[PDB]
From Swiss-Prot, chain F:
Gene name tied to this protein: MT-ND5
UniProt-recorded name of the protein: NADH-ubiquinone oxidoreductase chain 5
Subunit structure: Core subunit of respiratory chain NADH dehydrogenase (Complex I) which is composed of 45 different subunits.
Transmembrane segments: 4-24, 43-63, 84-104
Compartment list: Mitochondrion inner membrane
Function: Core subunit of the mitochondrial membrane respiratory chain NADH dehydrogenase (Complex I) which catalyzes electron transfer from NADH through the respiratory chain, using ubiquinone as an electron acceptor. Essential for the catalytic activity and assembly of complex I.
Family classification: Belongs to the complex I subunit 5 family.
Swiss-Prot record, chain H:
Keywords: Electron transport, Membrane, Mitochondrion, Mitochondrion inner membrane, NAD, Respiratory chain, Translocase, Transmembrane, Transmembrane helix, Transport, Ubiquinone
Organism: Ovis aries
Any GO CC annotation of this UniProt entry: respiratory chain complex I
Quaternary structure note: Core subunit of respiratory chain NADH dehydrogenase (Complex I) which is composed of 45 different subunits.
Reaction catalysed by this enzyme: a ubiquinone + NADH + 5 H(+)(in) = a ubiquinol + NAD(+) + 4 H(+)(out)
GO BP of this protein: electron transport coupled proton transport; mitochondrial electron transport, NADH to ubiquinone; mitochondrial respiratory chain complex I assembly
Name of the protein this chain belongs to: NADH-ubiquinone oxidoreductase chain 4
EC number(s) recorded for this UniProt protein: 7.1.1.2
Amino acid sequence: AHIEPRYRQFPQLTRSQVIQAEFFSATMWFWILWRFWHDSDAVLGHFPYPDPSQWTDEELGIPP
Amino acid sequence: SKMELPDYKQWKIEGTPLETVQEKLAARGLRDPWGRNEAWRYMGGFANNVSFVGALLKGFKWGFAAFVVAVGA
Amino acid sequence: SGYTPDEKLRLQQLRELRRRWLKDQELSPREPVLPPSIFAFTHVLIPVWIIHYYLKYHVTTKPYTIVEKKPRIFPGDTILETGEVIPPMKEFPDQ
Amino acid sequence: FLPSAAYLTHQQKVLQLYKRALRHLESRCVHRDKYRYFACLLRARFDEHKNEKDMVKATQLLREAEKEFWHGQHPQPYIFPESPGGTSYERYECYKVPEWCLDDWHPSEKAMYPDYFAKREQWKKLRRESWEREVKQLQEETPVGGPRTEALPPARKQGDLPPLWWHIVTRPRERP
Amino acid sequence: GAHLARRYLGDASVEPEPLRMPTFPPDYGFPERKEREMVATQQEMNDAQLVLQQRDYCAHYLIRFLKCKRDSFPNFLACKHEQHDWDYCEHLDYVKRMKEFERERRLLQRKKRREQREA
Amino acid sequence: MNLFSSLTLVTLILLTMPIAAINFNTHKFTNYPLYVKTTISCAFITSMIPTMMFIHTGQEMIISNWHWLTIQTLKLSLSFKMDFFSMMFVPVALFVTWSIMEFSMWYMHSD
Amino acid sequence: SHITKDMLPGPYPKTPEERAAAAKKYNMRVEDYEPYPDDGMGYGDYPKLPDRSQQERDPWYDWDHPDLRLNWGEPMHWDLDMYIRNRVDTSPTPVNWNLMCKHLFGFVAFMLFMFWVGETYPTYQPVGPKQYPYNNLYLERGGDPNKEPEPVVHYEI
Amino acid sequence: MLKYIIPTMMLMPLTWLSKNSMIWINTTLHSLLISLTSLLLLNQFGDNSLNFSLTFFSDSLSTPLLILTMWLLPLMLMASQHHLSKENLARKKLFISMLILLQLFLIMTFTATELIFFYIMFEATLVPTLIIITRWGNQTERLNAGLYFLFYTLAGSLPLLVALIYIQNTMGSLNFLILQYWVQPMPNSWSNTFMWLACMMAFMVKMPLYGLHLWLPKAHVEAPIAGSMVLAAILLKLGGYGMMRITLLLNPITDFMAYPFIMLSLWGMIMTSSICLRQTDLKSLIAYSSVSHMALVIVAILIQTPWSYMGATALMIAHGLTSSMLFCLANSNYERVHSRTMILARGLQTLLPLMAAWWLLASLTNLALPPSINLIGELFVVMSTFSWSNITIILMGLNMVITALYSLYMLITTQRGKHTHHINNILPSFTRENALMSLHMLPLLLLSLNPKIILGPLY
Amino acid sequence: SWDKDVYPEPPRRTPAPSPQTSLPNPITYLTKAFDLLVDRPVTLVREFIERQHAKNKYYYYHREFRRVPDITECHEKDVLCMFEAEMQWKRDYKVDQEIVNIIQERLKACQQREGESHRQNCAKELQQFTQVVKAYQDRYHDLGAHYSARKCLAKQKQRMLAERKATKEAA
Amino acid sequence: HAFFKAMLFMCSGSIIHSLNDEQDIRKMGGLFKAMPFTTTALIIGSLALTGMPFLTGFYSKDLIIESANTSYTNAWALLMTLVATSFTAIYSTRIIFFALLGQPRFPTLININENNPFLINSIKRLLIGSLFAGFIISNNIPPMTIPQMTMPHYLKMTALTVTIL
Amino acid sequence: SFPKYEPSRLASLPTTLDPAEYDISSETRKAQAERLAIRSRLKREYQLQYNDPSRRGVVEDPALIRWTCARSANVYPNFRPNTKTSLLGALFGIGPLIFWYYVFKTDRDRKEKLIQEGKLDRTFNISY
Amino acid sequence: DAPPLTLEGIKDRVLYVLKLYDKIDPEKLSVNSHFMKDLGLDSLDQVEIIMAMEDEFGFEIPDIDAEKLMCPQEIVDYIADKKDVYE
């Protein structure tokens, strides 16, 4: 069939374009989940942040 | 081209923004808007079109089960 | 405000003439005008052949022509032409 | 500055301020419902002293209202995508070819479109045949020594077409 | 950050700066702790066509990373253990540069304390 | 190596053809967008390959020929190079522009 | 082929007859026909207009010419060559003029002043130098492959 | 080249003794014959120039100008009808033979071995174009325009004669070769100052310089089309050619006295790009554009650099082609609307649909589009002058910006936006006019492919 | 071919791959496809062209010269002597331009083959480039446009006279 | 960026021609559930702005701000880039909120359409480009630089935190 | 309420807030009627010369040709050399020219002085 | 990009969106019905009518034609002039 305009109503839709729309948004969300757990944890950068340098003295002849 | 002209006085107005402005402006004491021009804009398949987090997050209504399958891998 | 009856009548004659002119601009006589991938991949193939013909022979016989940043050799691998080991990477520890 | 007279009126200037202030409110006041609210507010603010029989009071408050309108105008209003200044504004001027042309086509192309060009031939003879008598007579008689308007009366005398029909009616379709 | 606001609120002595980094001289009081690992094989490194400002320490991990990436090229998601080792070693170098900075910091703080108490 | 050189040179020279085609046609490709679409598709498929060879090996190259006016101590030819940027920039622009060809088939419909 | 007398020699005087003949020659309002005055800048006896002329004259007046805002007998303003739409749009300004220029130059000065603040106060992180192997990377600076070593080493912390 | 000279004479009398309705074909055919015939000259090999006994020689400074003039002749003639087509048979034969005799003096001028001969053939170039523009000057002060032309060109060019006789009786004969060989430096006295001022002042007037550039616009707005093209291209680039000749002598004083001329040329080049931004009168904008390009030429000639000389002769040839083309399109528009003003001819995108393509192509050649020879010339001028003074790139780049600006402005002003819906008299474009378009721009692009011909003797 | 005397090239050093994968090897599949598709008929066309011009031959040579003696062995006028001197001098100038061209081509080659080892094994070629261009700056540069030959020799006397007096006082 | 805004411009102009070439945010309001293929394309593009963690639009922008804060930087430029990343977050949210979420405003006689294989293939093609090929290009490049990889607290998370606020 | 829209050489004073109009005199209305009449008669002559169907030429505007001859060639008559003319001609003729001539003096002096010395960056300066 | 438009369809649509408005009756609504003369509705709300029909059809009719229509038939005339709807 063709496509038709309508006056002041909610427009008609095919099921195909809306099912590809749901398919693509859900694959985006699947990519952010299957990227957000699967190998990273990259927003937290794989290394504990070291302190002010050691919070210890005895560093190669510090002055007593 | 047929159009069927979806008729006047059908709307039976009742809508939320137009109802608030009619009540507040009747309390002001005028009651003369343009009126019911926009019931087709405010309701139908309209009238709770999706809010913020549903709009930004339309995806997870099917993606979580796919991620469960990915955990199953 | 409002028109005069003469201005309305003038507009009515313009309506009549504009209807006739645009109805004249309608046409479908059922003779409006009248008369008085193997191609694709051979189009792919043939300039490839011509420019490779050009790109070996004249390009090569000109000496300082198309040149390269060299492929990168490795400390633990071999050479395809000569063939020997480079002395490999040193001690591993603290890993 | 109008084709009918010189003075506009008080009422025309008031009404143009009404259309401009309401259009600016459309642009300022999106979601359309608080717009509809403020449209009733503006219509009430005109109804605050609609009752004035006076003239100097009306034009003095009109001048103060012009101050109030320029006080809160908007930078880029919702001008329509057909209005001048707007988005189109002879967007589709790509094929507004003027209608005096098409005389200068090669006769092969005029063999391609036979009946339409025969119809243009009889239109053009309808133009030339009906230019001398009625149009030249109404352009002798009806113009006064000062025409004093930008609008002509039709040929309501007896018969055929009103004068100056050609480059008014025969304008392009505004649509390629 | 934090060191920056402390330096800009404090006086110019007790919080030293970069770009003039040798401030207290080398081998001040060192108990002979210097190995300077040098696993580079710098001739073999220049043979392996590396980059300026990569001819550094921890570079043999980068060599192995380039080696495994060359050896399995369509394995698009292979080399991350040796990439992680290279990251770990440059992380250690970052620790070392932070140690040098705050060591000069505490040196200058104690030196100004000691000259204030001796004078 | 000759392959990488000829593949970059055809990813340039496979774009020149349709303009000279319509200047030497005199007839109407009504499907002229389809023609442009298939030559951009050929350019993208011959440009995805040598980037993969590039990062596979390294192996950077410059090409240079067809000089004019080697006048003073300098010269000039048509000289262009394919390195890291000059290879991993080409399929980006090609793929983007192939999709914009599709969108322009739609958007320039009645014009 | 044209009448010589419909050209424009001389300035405005004499004030009855030359003003009368020039007002009938250019077809304007009689007493509002302006000479410049006789400024000696050439300029003859040609009129002066309110200088904006193009983003006034709204396109709903529906005169003859499409984009010149012209109607074939007009003074044809002396500075129209600077006034055409596509060249200078003398629109009524949305705010002011002095307000525009003062806020713009003040904001540029404010940003450049804080740029000088940025130029004098850098940021950094608690970081020393790198540790380049061969005496802060000899043989990959300028060279001298057999002449000039300067011994200075790296020490660990 | 005497085998090229004797058909230039004997191309004349056929135009007399041809029957009616047949002069046109004969002139065009034999002109194109001689075009190829002197295109065969191009064998300038390596070290020397090429000589012929006591009258003729050829550098690379003269051969592309020669080929350009003999290319210009069918273009010159074929533009020059339809405004004198209905005029008389005898007067039309007189006109065409006058153009042919003009070009014969031009070829004598471009292959002038000696310099006294060069002065004589220089004012031989002067004289017939006066007659042509004054008989067919097409407008109301052709009187004034021809008079300014004649007195400026003589009263600039005349003391050059006395200076050349002075050089004659101080250094023997005035061959170009002995003056290459028996030259000796002439120091910073005042006599050298006045001699250099005389010679360079005559040529400054010929270019024109900015100080006397009111010469040009009247001489273009009141000339016919063939005289316009010949005047612009051949006369101004011939003036540049003569300066390129005689600047070989007088080395050290041009270091002193070259300062105000370069200054005047730079600032007036900017003022000329300012003046052709706002005027009406579509024909005259290209005239002021030519003033600005020749000021650029003048900077290039006096700075005395091999890059400068190569780019200078490149700019000569490219600007000759582009200016002649754009004059031809101005003639086409005036054939349409009979106006010469600018704001009347508007629109013309639908109407004359492919004329716009040639307008665009000409405006892009005048843009300095980059593979075009125009940009090669301007670029090497900028390189040489930045070696010369290292801060002068401000006026060069500002010239570039405003030059692109007014060129594209004259493009999108006349031929972009709206038909004025009262014209009724544009016709679809004649095959003659588009034939002249292809006569202009196909040899320009084929020159753009292999431009190793047109560069200067310091190649 | 060419002259490797004038155009030296470094020894080829080609590494060898090692998978350690089971893809198996798409790029080898495609490069064998490219060779067995394109490389056969183009080589056959080369063979056809070689034979059909190997029927009969032409010959071009290199134009070699004599030596005309000098310019300082010509007197103040000597047009039949100075002409020979200048043409021999100007041809020397042109071939020296191409000398500088060839050295710049070698420098481009050294930049390209090294990749990012800029400061190694290009000291030799850039160094001799600086040497020849210091010579060219000293000898053919500060002479301007209308060079004949005599401006070069006046420059020559000027340079050696000035440096002679400077090293005279500073000796 | 190239994949990103090619996709975004094509989506946006598709919507503009879908609603009669009017192009203004005023009288455009509710287009969600009017077929959500192009609208979904718009919101995936806009959430791919700010680099929602962690997508193809994440990598470059966040490595840039991390390398900028881990440098000998300006003390004005990093603050300006932080504020402008917050501002591109807010006009991204405004273009979504005025494109879809509000109650619908448009003239009547609507003709909203995607019945074309060309448009759906082009938008499909570029969102497939922006979900995978950004990662594919970003991953297998030899590092000609040395990445920082060692950042303090709120010197890696912080631009994401600022986009959230 | 507002700074009342200051005039400028760019500020188009709009047709609404003058405020100098709004006590419109009767004779000013008479002048507006005159202006309407003049444009009326001119458009009538335009339509009469315009709608002839056999007129093949252009509308032949006298006003535009009047303006063009006014602008191009009818400047030099009339002219008298005045004080303001001479001042503005000197300020636009000699000022910028003598200024850039000064800076080229300074540039040539510094450049030849410094290459007279030899502490200049011409290690290889080939394309002179 | 070219929807089907008729005079009857556009006339019924204009009469429809008139009849939705409040203070006119749906009773006495006529295609020939003077807004100024024989209906008695105010000119100010007649310009509200002008505004809303402009907003529906998506083009501003000018101020100079915001004066002199006063009836639905001339409204259909002017909208058919701007849109060029005849066959």
